[PDB]
Every structure is written in C-alpha cells, then in structure tokens.
Design a protein around this ligand. Structure first.
Ligand SMILES: [K+]
Ligand SMILES: [K+]
Ligand SMILES: [K+]
Ligand SMILES: [K+]
Ligand SMILES: [K+]
Ligand SMILES: [K+]
Ligand SMILES: [K+]
Ligand SMILES: [K+]
Lengths: 305, 305, 305, 305
C-alpha cells in the first residue's frame, strides 16, 4: 500500500460544502483563474449598473447600449471623462451614482484584500525549507538514534523554527480494534525544549531511541519488514514578515537507512563558515550494531564489571 | 438544567460597554447591515461637506441644494466631471477641498480595512471542522478510554491543529463553597505532545481514564446519574492563510455512549486511500466492562499470578 | 513605596532612540494628532510638487501660486478637472506627473496601512477584559488558595484565553546581592494546562499555596507586614478577529483579603444561565485558619490517627 | 575561528532559488530600490498599454508616441483629463480600457500590500530590545549562575516577552562523529515558566548551573580555554500592534565574566521608580568561588555536620 504523505508535504487521502470559506477557495487558485474571476466580477457590475442607467434612460451624450457602459465604467473607476456627465433633471440618476460608488468601493476592497493574502501567503516562503531525503539510524554517545536533516535554503530568513514528527503505523488493540493510521508523536526535543530550532546552518534533528520510542524493539533485520511512515513537520517564522509557515515531508520504512550518518555540510573558509549545500542529502555508513535499542540496553546493563 | 455549550460552539450564558471596540461590533454584523452602515457613512459626509460648499456659496455651474451634492461627491470620490469645477476667487473653497480629500481617504481606509477582516475572518474557515456527534467510553489496550472523533471536511486546508477539552461539572468544596460550573482540563495529549494533531484523515481523540481523570470512578451504571458536560476545543491554522481559528462542541452526559466504538472511516481504493465521511458520526458497540476505571485497575492489580 | 503596576495595567516606571519604529509611534497617537499628521503630510507633498510645476513654468490655465496647487492636488488625488490639463510642449512636465502619481500612491499606502492597524489594534478589544478588584486567600478542599476573578464583559468574543501571574518582591541573596523587583511565576495552571481558560462565565483563577508557592510561610498575621505585589496577565484571542490581546492588573499586599471568598455571579433564570455582573468584584468572609500554609500542612501531617 | 552570531543578531554563515518568495525579497530591500522597482513597474505597464492604444490607432486628440502615454497613464490612474477621451467607433478600444483598469487595480494592490508589510515589519520594533554586552558567572543563594541582562529601551511597548538561549559548541561523539556547531538549549525558565518575561524594567535572566547545565564542570580556570558561544533569543509582542518580533545576541567565551555581578539600574525618585539605563551594561566583581559548579556541590554535600 502506497504512502500517506508525499516528500513534498501533500497528503494522499481524498475527502460543495467548502463554500463556507469562498475566500480561501479564491486564494488557493492559480493567478490565471484569479484574474479571470476579477475580470468577470468587474464586467458583471458594469453590465448591471449600465443596464440601470439605460433603465434610467441626468444623461449626457448617450446613444445605444455601448454608450452606457463607458459611463458606468468611468463612474465606478471614477474616471468620468466629461463627455458623459450628469444633469439634475431626474431624482433617480443622482442617487444611483452614490449606491454605485459606494458599492464600487466594496468590490475593490474584496480585491485588494484578496490580493494581499495571495502575495503574502507564506506557502511560497516555506518552499525554501528542506528535509534530508532520507533518515538514518545509528549510534551517538552510546545511544541509538533516528536522525534527519533540516534546513532553509535562504540565509536571510526564518532562523527561529520548531520541529515535530509523528509516526504513522497500523495498530490492533488487544480488544481487536483496528487503527489503520494510528499516529504517535516522536520525541525530537519537546521535553527539553530542543525542538525549538535555531537554523544557523542545516541541523541534524535527532530522536534518541529509548524505552518510550516506537522504535525501541526494531532491529536492523526487523526494519525492512516494518510498515511504518514518519511524517515530519516544521513550523517557523519569516524574519522579514511576522507570519508563520508550515513545511512537511515523510520518511517511509525504505528511506530509513540503518547504520549511516549525515555528511557534514559546514566547513571553514578563509576565516569564515560556508555551508556546502551539495552535501545536504548526503549520508555515509559506519560500523553500527545490528541489534534493536532494547537489546543494546540489556547487553549494556549486564556489562557493569 | 440545560447545556452550557451548544454542539455548534455557541454558549448558553447571557451577560453599551462594548463600545470600546466598535470595529469588532462592525465585523460581527451580517452584510445587509454592514453595507447599510457604509451607505449611510458616505451620505452623511457628502451631506456635511456639500452643506459647507453651500456655506461657501470658486464655484462653477451650481444652483439649488442638489447641485452641491454631485460636486461634493465627485470631489470626494475624486470624479470631478468638469461641469462643476473650481475657481480661485475665494480662499475658503480652495482649502476645504484639501481637508475633504484628506478626510475622504480616511473614510475609505476605515472601509477597506473594515472589509478585509470581514472577508478574512476565519469563523468561516473553521466551519468545515467537525466533531463526532457523540463520545464513547470503551477499552483500548487494557485501559478504559473516553473518545471523540475530530476532522476537517476540506482536504486542502488546516492539517496542523491542536485539541483540548474541559470538563464542566458542579462542585462543592469540603468547606462547603459551591462552584456551579467548575471546570477541569481533560488530558488528551498535553504531556506527551499528542494533542498536536495532524489531520490527514479524521482522528479519534482519546482520553485514557486513569487515576487523574475526572472519570476515574464513574461506572457504566453511574454515568447516567452524573451531571457533567465536556467542552471540546480545536484550534488549528489554515494552510493557505497564516491566521488561526477556533472550533468547539460539547458532549453532555447523555451523548457519552458506554461500551461503543467509532466506525472506521478510512478504506483502501484502487491503490489509494479514501475517507468515507458517511461513517463519520457512526459508532457501534463491543463487549466492554461495566465497571469504573478505578475498580478495573484494582481487579487487575490483584491478578498478578 | 508606591506600586509597580496600576490596576489598569500601565507600569509606574520611567525609561529620540524610539525613532527606530516611527510607525509604532504613529499608531499610539490620539486621533486628533494622527489626522493632523496626515493633513500636514498631504499639504507638504502638494506644496513640494506644486513648486515643481511652477519651476516647470505643458500647462493650461495657470496664473500665480494658488493655481499650481489646485492642479498638483487634482493630479495627485487624480481629480484633474479639465480646466487645468497637460500639453506636450515640454519633456519635463510629462515625466513629473508619473513620479508624482507613483509617489502619491506611496503616501496613500502609508496612510491606509496606517489606519488599518489603528482601527484594528486590539488594545480596544481587551478593554472589556476584567480582573476582580481584590484577591482572596482561603481554604478549598483542604488546601489554602490565593484566588482572583477573571472575566470578559462581552458575550460575543474572546472565550479562549490564558492566564499567568508573577509575584514582584524585593530580595537579598545570601551573598548579599539586592534585587529590588525580583519576580517569580505564580502557579495558576501551567503544569496541568489549567491556565488555558475557557471564558464561558467569569472564572475564579486559583493558586494553591503549596511548598513551592512564594506564599507558603505567610500567615494571616504576616501578610500585612509583607511588601509584595502580584501582577496578573491575561492573553486571549478575539473570536471575530484572529489577533491576540493582553490585559493586566495588579494586586498589592493590602488588596489581598485573608479569609474571604468570591460571591457567585452565575444564577439560573427561567431555564437559563445569567451572569449577574454586579456581584463580580464582591467577596465575603468565611471561617478560615489564620495559620500559614506551611504550618497547616504540618499540623495536618501530624494528625494521621 | 570567529563567531557564529554577531552581537546584533546576524549570523556569520553563508549559503536564484529564493525566487520562490519574491515578495519577501521585495520587503527586505532598502527604500531607494523599492521605490525604483515601483517607478519601473508603473512605467512598463504604461509603456505596454500605451503601445496597445497606438496599435489601436475611439481616440481623441492623439498625435505621435508621447500622446498615447498621457492617456494610458490618465486612464490607469483614472485621471482622464477630458482632452483625450473615448469614442465608440471601434470595438477594440472600448474593451482594452476594462482589462487595463482591472489590471491597473492589480498592480496597485501588489503595491499597497507591499507597502503595508514594509512599514509594519517589526524588525524596526525589535531594534529597541537590548541585551547586556556581557554575561556573568557568580553565586546566588548558594547556586552558581550564568546571567545576562535583558531590556527594551521604550516604555510604551512590548512588556510581555519570552527568553531562550542555545549553547553552540563543537562535539565529538564516542563513535567519533564530529559536530562542528552542536547546539543545546540552556535552561532559563522553561520548566517553571520563568522564561515568560514581564519587562517592567530590564531583567537579569539567570541560568542556574546545575548537573544538567553544559556549564557544570567549567571552573574559572577552565573557562578561558573553552571554545563556546551562547546565542540568546528574545521573542516578544508589540503592545500597540499584535505582531511578534525576534531579537538576538551572542556571548562568546571571552564575554563571560567570572565572578562579576550586574549593576542595579533601578532606583527610587521623589516617590517613583526610574531606570538609569546608563548602568545597563555595567557589571562589577564580588568574591566568588573559583571552582566549577560540580566541585562546589561536592564540597557542599560533604559538609553536613
Ligand atoms: K512539556
Ligand atoms: K474630467
Ligand atoms: K507540558
Ligand atoms: K509545562
Ligand atoms: K479618479
Ligand atoms: K477623475
Ligand atoms: K476626471
Ligand atoms: K515544559
């Protein structure tokens, strides 16, 4: 069975009713459509209001249908060339112009506010956030760890960030209840506050595999047989702009390399630090026990001399 | 006595002074009124400023009252047809136009900013968030649990979210002090960070009923006799738009089904995952102890062979 | 010596350099000044640009100084009456109009964005938040507690909120180092998550005075002799508008009543709940030990029969 | 090797692809460039659209190239002087004006929204936040502490804030894996909630050096030999404006003074409190053990009489 979360963050699960937030529907559109909406939205008002001037036919230099348009438009954009102006003969025309120019300001506001979000939406910001292409399991100061690399491709922004991971795996309860996509938080710094990143250079996020880890009894041999997927979420804030952004990826069982290690990316240069973003996804192997974490602990606690 | 929080989130408790944030009063209005405000707001300025042109009567082609309006309007919307223009004979008229066109820009700003929030307000966003219609109590890996289902009806948005629950119940302290609506947080993931949802598909939020649970000594038999209400709060963020949203529901004692279980909603399809949102509210029963959690623990701790 | 934080939230401590955020300086102004800024800001541009038209004197119907203004204004607000229009005789005038109408759009943006925040700033929102006028110390299910009341005067908004309190008191370290306003967090729900309020009706925030409380050894007799001040902070979110708000108050030693209790405010009405906001600040006394919490615990632990 | 984080917050690490968020690229620009962009952006549209009027040559008083501009401009800014107006002879010209005035409103929105953020961006706000120029290590109620001073130079804003610190130091794991910039959170209030500042007056942030501190075995003698750097992050919220801001500094090994103490800044004045911001960075020495924290604890635990 395929994956739940793609490496680019999108899910693989499918769900009229969403008309509750049409605005949200409007921002997620590609520009081509978005403009086309606004093209239409303006015409339909200019059609409607023009057809009320012709119902009112106060008028200067107006003939067939086409003539009322160039006015209704020039009135609403507030152009008013002066070839088509207003008289005071009728009560009706003089008040339409007010409702029109009030309402013309509404449509503009729906548009400006509409545009702001569209340009300001930070999905674009978080596009420079990056997760290592694989995860690794290997030893680190005696303890076996699951590790992935995190980083932002721009220097200038989002240095504050925070990381979290969920393990998605099927489960059957003792009572035989089946949970297809049961999920459990994977400890990556929460209790100590080490999940609050400071993205100077790309970081290796580590999860120490201990008695509480879902990974406690997985050995090297078991891993390939396990059907599990780690979703990895990063939420940070753009320095230049208050707003916050999410970025996610996934690691499926076969993208977890046992007994590897991440290539360093940071190196010294003419008395400076340069991040070699080419070694970003790069790993390498090292002698690493084949045993589960649980069995390592046991072996270790029985060696006390 | 009736409920405190309706299933749609609104409270059932009633509280001039709120004139402190008139802006907030303005957004919570239904459009019909909102536009009517702005209709009025524009007229009253056009009335006031027009009545200052007539006090100043610099003027071109102006007769009775109606004539000053079409100018004051055309000056403030900055139409200026050119049938009614300005001369330099008077000092007063030339400076009014500046205060007017400065002030006309203020009113517009109150309106645009007013509209932005109105369209952007995320009450509409959170309308697709949904809580199961009931809660269930039943066993799960040996431990008795209170469970409700959570989900968002759209795929495209708010996948990050976070859940919390409060129990509302009357209390008398030993000292005899009476607390009508005493509330206590109900553990749904806080300590482990499992209250930070990832809404791929609708989730069963679980509360394990343990020595700290307010539900520790409620048996199946007791439950119906208890007068309690669980308020359930969900706060997440719209992917497409930075802003965050709240959604709430309530479960009153009679909407807690003892010995049931939630129908799975997720199923496989042609090598894919589809959420059958029809089974969303659906539960079913299973053999489940009738005992309180406290008495189960006891019975269990005395069985150690 | 007087208080550090007034009951309305403002501090009593005094601190050119703040020109770093002139925008922030602009919003905190009272409207009278704010408008006066914008009045001036517009004139000074209309003065400058008009004086560049007169340097360029492309022109129609322009005499003395006053004539260039009504154009520069009509060009920048984009009125353009058509009594003063443009010719193509000069290269200079034709390009000024572009820089002008580009720059005129900048000033407007500084103003609209300036206004938005001014109206949207939520200091006004949090004005309906309210703290009890006093705090009380008295017993509650065996444990001695410090309690203050919290609430929002509007029904319609900010039901989610969160509370925190700091105790400000002078300190000398063993090493004799003097800390005038040393502050310590006062536990009001943090560890259990009970500091995450749900403001249905006004709540009694409680702090259980235990071995970790700064209040552990204060008896009834000691209290008046103590020189301490509790600052109380409330941060919630306006339902109708995403943004968050702070509200603070203070309790100084003499506003802590020992052996009292808050009048209930909530009562039943024709099968409903009504909050009697008149009893909001109201307390009353009850028989309450005079002893410190520490000495109560001792007396209690020695009574085990 | 030099420092990772400058005292003003900027990093010393270097990283086309950033075209993903051009908007963010646009705000981080200095005004000179920003305006120049908008100058250009407007001209290029006025060039393009003017060249479509000349392709359409509906026209009044239009000669060479220069004449179409003053129209295309007056149409898009919606000036329309009335010397160059529209006729109904052609179908094409009448519809261009609509696409033009729709599209003219788009460019404006990109600009206004562009300006808002630029003025509202809070990098400017956080410029008044300040960190002591050094850190100190010395004793405090028996426990050895690392201390730095924090404060905001304005009274009127950002009183709520929150502090966090990371220690950056090289590491080699037992397995010989090398971590150049390994970082660990430094405890400054997280567990007790004392990292949630209330910036009445500048505060001394303290980190008690205990068995969990990275500083546990550093003695006075060792310190100078250590190659370590403390990054210090402050995130608070501007009262007058909802938005939040980050401010950072760094302390490198030689800016940690052993056996010093911060000069008090707060003093009493005519029955008031005044902060003498001149003594802000000022420290002074006091008799302080030369031993590491670890060795002090030992010596202390062996003295129990
Ligand atoms: K925690
Ligand atoms: K005109
Ligand atoms: K916690
Ligand atoms: K905590
Ligand atoms: K205009
Ligand atoms: K005009
Ligand atoms: K005009
Ligand atoms: K914690």
């Amino acid at each position: 069975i395929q994956r739940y979360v793609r490496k680019d963050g999108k899910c693989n699960v499918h769900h009229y009713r969403y008309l509750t937030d049409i605005f949200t529907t409007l921002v997620d559109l590609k520009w081509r459509f978005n403009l086309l909406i606004f093209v239409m939205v303006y015409t339909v008002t200019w059609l409607f209001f023009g057809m009320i001037w012709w119902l009112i036919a106060c008028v200067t230099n107006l003939n067939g249908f086409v003539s009322a348009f160039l006015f209704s438009i020039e009135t609403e954009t507030t152009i008013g060339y002066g070839y088509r102006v207003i008289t005071d003969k009728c009560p009706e025309g003089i008040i339409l112009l007010l409702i029109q120019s009030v309402l013309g300001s509404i449509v503009n506001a729906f548009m400006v506010g509409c545009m702001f979000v569209k340009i300001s939406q930070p999905k674009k910001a978080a596009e420079t956030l990056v997760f290592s292409t694989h995860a690794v399991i290997s030893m680190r100061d005696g303890k076996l760890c699951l590790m992935f690399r995190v980083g932002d491709l721009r220097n200038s922004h989002i240095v504050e960030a925070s990381i979290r991971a969920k393990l998605i795996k099927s489960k059957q309860t003792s009572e035989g209840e089946f949970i297809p996509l049961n999920q459990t938080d994977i400890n990556v710094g929460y209790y100590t506050g080490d999940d609050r990143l400071f993205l100077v250079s790309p970081l290796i996020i580590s999860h120490e595999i201990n008695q509480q880890s879902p990974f406690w009894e997985i050995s090297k041999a078991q891993l390939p047989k396990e059907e599990l997927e780690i979703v990895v979420i990063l939420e940070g804030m753009v320095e230049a702009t208050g707003m916050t952004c999410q970025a996610r990826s996934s690691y499926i069982t076969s993208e977890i390399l046992w007994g590897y290690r991440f290539t360093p990316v940071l190196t010294l240069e003419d008395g400076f630090y340069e991040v070699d973003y080419n070694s970003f996804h790069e790993t390498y192997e090292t002698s690493t026990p084949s045993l589960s974490a649980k069995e390592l602990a046991e072996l270790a606690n029985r060696a006390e001399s």
